[PDB]
């Protein structure tokens, strides 16, 4: 009788059961062991290398594993592959579509990912023998704006498009090996775990669903946020991850806890977050807010360790090097401030 | 090495800088345009009436040596709270609204809330909107046929009359111009409600005449960069 309402109430009681199971293992929080370790203080990082080569607003960026070559996306149709050590542009990829929203550096440095409102993930070859940069694979199977994507290897990547579905692509042939379905809202950002076996993607439903690359199914669902999760980054330990949504709060979820542990909230900041990254140790949560300033949130002390000056427009892209050497912050002013 | 790969990387950076300076000329020369509507609001006719131009994703037209980048969004999803933020450096937001769709659904109020969200946005607040009241050829007979009235989905029509500063079309019922301009002022009521001075609505009655609609975009985009530069020098 009333299979629609029956399944709705079954989902409701399952949600209550999951919430009760979360609260059962939530006898304490991350803010209750704050009297056991020393704080970090207000450390103000400075712009070490300034990257001014973009024409339109910089919407996406990604660091390389060498922590030297960083790529960045902008609405001008250019994918500038910077060199953070010498402040040089290694490549300027002419993009097919002007508006692009995603950027992903290959773990080997040979490939790069792009895409946006075109619903097409344009993979470009970096170390190719053809001289300039050309397209390597045209991953066109999404029906929404490709918000963010990450590079597992030079063979398969995962993209979070605006069609409420993520998908593990394949650079070899160009088809979705497995589609990550389950997001009720358009997915805005995904993050790869250091183990690269599973990933979590933050969508516009305040639910950063944890997926598994191997089985292609949704592992967990983290419904602790309140607005569109535009940023996400997996804790360097691999069992946790932070999220940046439009509700002006960041939350550090844990895969082994299936709930939020830390709430990076501050009444002085009311703008949303679209840039989240962790340091080498995960203590500093680089969170790029929409007030033109990035707050270096302490993942264990519930406070920012000093906001980031410089950028005068919304920072929609931010990443920390694989060794935590520096963090390149790119905002909507066509600039990339690399902090250290 | 010391100056083998360092100087070579610097030369590559210089070549990339030259290419980027060459592309910045055309980037600032062309004006990106956001073409969107409330769903089957006649935007297909605007894509047709724009340089007669990978389907409906982006069209480029050039008038008086001024190229434009009219980006259509007829292939995205319904939720438009994130991809519309990518149009923050866009020059104009051409809102193609079916002016005769106030009942068929109440697409005007759907477009009003779309216009109000575009107008009062956090990123689209510094960008004007070229209001294209499309489907006007159907509005020329929609109010007289009785199949679609204004009062059933807009009670402010009884308290509204044709403005004195209006330019009615020769050969139209004053009830049509009263209804056509009510839709214009309905979008303008929420447009001028911002009061920021950084962006102003450009209401045009589209699909009524088959003239060059990009010429209307050209004259609007000309005043867009005018008032943007006027606001830059505190002259407006």
């Amino acid at each position: 009788g009333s299979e629609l309402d029956q399944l709705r109430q079954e989902a409701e009681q399952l949600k209550n059961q999951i919430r009760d199971a979360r609260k059962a293992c939530a006898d304490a929080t991350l803010s209750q062991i704050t009297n056991n370790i020393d704080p970090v203080g207000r450390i103000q990082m400075r712009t070490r290398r300034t990257l001014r080569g973009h024409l339109a607003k910089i919407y996406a960026m990604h660091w390389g594993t060498d922590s030297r070559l960083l790529v960045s996306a902008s609405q001008d149709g250019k994918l500038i592959i910077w060199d953070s050590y010498t402040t040089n542009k290694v490549h300027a990829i002419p993009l097919r579509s002007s508006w692009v929203m995603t950027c992903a550096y290959a773990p080997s440095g040979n490939y790069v990912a792009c895409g946006g409102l075109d619903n097409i993930c344009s993979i470009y070859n970096l170390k190719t023998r053809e001289g300039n940069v050309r397209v390597s694979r045209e991953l066109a199977g999404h029906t929404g704006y490709l918000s963010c994507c990450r590079f597992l290897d030079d063979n398969q990547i995962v993209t979070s498009s605006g069609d409420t579905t993520c998908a593990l692509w394949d650079i070899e042939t160009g088809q979705q090996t497995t589609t990550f379905t389950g997001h009720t809202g358009d997915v805005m950002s995904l993050s790869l775990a250091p183990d690269t076996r599973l990933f979590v993607s933050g969508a516009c439903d305040a639910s950063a669903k944890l997926w598994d690359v191997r089985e292609g199914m949704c592992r967990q669902t983290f419904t602790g946020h309140e607005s569109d999760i535009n940023a996400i980054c997996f804790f360097p330990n691999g069992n946790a991850f932070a999220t940046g949504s439009d509700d002006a709060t960041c939350r550090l979820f844990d895969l082994r806890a299936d709930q939020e542990l830390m709430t990076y909230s501050h009444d002085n900041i009311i703008c949303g977050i679209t840039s989240v990254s962790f340091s080498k140790s995960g203590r500093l949560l680089l969170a790029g807010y929409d007030d033109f300033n990035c707050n270096v949130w302490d993942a264990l002390k519930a406070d920012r360790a000093g906001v980031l000056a410089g950028h005068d427009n919304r920072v929609s892209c931010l990443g920390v090097t694989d060794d935590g050497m520096a963090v390149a912050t790119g905002s909507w002013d066509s600039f990339l401030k690399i902090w250290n | 090495d010391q100056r083998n790969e360092e100087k070579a990387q610097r030369e590559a950076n210089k070549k990339i800088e030259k290419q980027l300076q060459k592309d910045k000329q055309v980037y600032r020369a062309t004006h990106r345009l956001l073409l969107l509507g409330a769903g089957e609001s006649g935007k297909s006719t605007i894509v047709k009436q724009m340089r007669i131009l990978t389907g409906i994703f982006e069209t480029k037209f050039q008038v008086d040596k001024v190229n434009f980048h009219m980006f259509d969004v007829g292939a995205q999803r319904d939720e438009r709270r994130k991809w519309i933020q990518c149009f923050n450096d866009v020059t104009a937001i051409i809102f193609v609204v079916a002016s005769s769709s106030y009942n068929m659904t109440n697409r005007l109020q759907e477009a009003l809330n779309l216009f109000k969200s575009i107008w009062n946005n956090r990123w689209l607040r510094t960008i004007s909107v070229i209001l294209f009241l499309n489907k006007q050829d159907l509005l020329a007979e929609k109010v007289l046929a009785g199949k679609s009235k204004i009062e059933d989905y807009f009670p402010e029509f009884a308290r509204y009359t044709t403005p004195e500063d209006a330019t009615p079309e020769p050969g139209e019922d004053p009830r049509v111009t009263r209804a056509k301009y009510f839709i214009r002022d309905e979008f303008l009521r929420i447009s001028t409600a911002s009061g920021d001075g950084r962006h102003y609505c450009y209401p045009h009655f589209t699909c009524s005449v088959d003239t060059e609609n990009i010429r209307r975009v050209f004259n609007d985009c000309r005043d867009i960069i005018q008032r943007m530069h006027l606001r830059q020098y505190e002259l407006l």
Partner: nanobody, 128 residues
């Protein structure tokens, strides 16, 4: 978690009164521009009313302008839509769609189905 349950509704006579109680839990209800949308059988999701974060910017659609009445309760975290002088065309499942970005006067919750911060939907229908 964002979750919106609207109590009330049902089958009433055209021209009477009706009031929906939208339970807004899981977010700062006093910081989001909460609004009301409906979806008539055979029609898409149409915006009905809207109210600011504190209760100043109150707006309604033309079909309900003067008839309905929205009122937010920031103390109880509840959004109300006092429906008065009902019409035969008010037969729709009213949703409690919420604006996603807080502290903003803009949002796109009038879009099609599968909206995140939207109520579950109460079938508010009338006779004739």
């Amino acid at each position: 978690q964002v979750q919106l349950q609207e109590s009330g509704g049902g089958l009433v006579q055209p021209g009477g009164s009706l009031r929906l109680s939208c339970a807004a839990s899981g977010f700062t209800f006093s910081n989001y521009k909460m609004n009301w949308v409906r979806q008539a059988p055979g029609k898409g999701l149409e915006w009905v009313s809207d109210i600011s974060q504190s209760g100043a910017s109150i707006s309604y659609t033309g079909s309900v302008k003067g008839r309905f009445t929205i009122s937010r309760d920031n103390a109880k975290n509840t959004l109300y839509l006092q429906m008065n002088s009902l019409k035969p065309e008010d037969t729709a499942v009213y949703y409690c769609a919420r604006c996603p970005a807080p502290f903003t006067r803009d949002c796109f919750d009038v879009t099609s189905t599968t909206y995140a911060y939207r109520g579950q939907g109460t079938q508010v229908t009338v006779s004739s």
